């Protein structure tokens, strides 16, 4: 009466199985990179050039008022 | 490097559950005897194992 049933795969077959490596490719260039580095360096070079005139300008005022008091 | 061990031990407990369920033994099932294999495989497995896969 009853028919076989075992364990079978379904009538069609089951989906496709990836197994290609899949390594992708993020993307920036050295060119770009080294570009980027170059000019945070520049950019942190002005904001410290700025800053240390202006503590050598402090400093400046500080001796001034230490040789006012000095007498 | 020592994390790809556990990363890859999951896969390799999920495998131990293939086994026992064909065997009812996770490593050391003796499932393949000269004359074929033991037992039929159940009814949900070969659906399980293309899940995994």
């Known amino acids: ?71 | 490097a020592m994390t790809p061990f556990f990363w890859m031990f999951e896969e390799r407990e999920k495998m131990f559950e293939f086994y026992e369920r064909v065997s009812g033994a996770r490593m050391h099932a003796a499932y393949i005897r000269p004359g074929g294999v033991h037992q039929d495989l159940p009814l949900g497995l070969l659906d399980d194992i293309y899940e995994f896969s």
């Open chain 1, 1 to 71: 009466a009853s028919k076989v049933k075992q364990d079978m795969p379904p009538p069609g077959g089951y989906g496709p199985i990836d197994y290609k490596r899949n390594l992708p490719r993020r993307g920036l260039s050295g060119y770009s990179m080294f570009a980027v580095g170059i000019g945070t360096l520049l950019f942190g070079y002005w904001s410290m050039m700025k800053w240390n005139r202006e503590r050598r300008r402090l400093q400046i005022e500080d001796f001034e008022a230490r040789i006012a008091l000095m007498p």
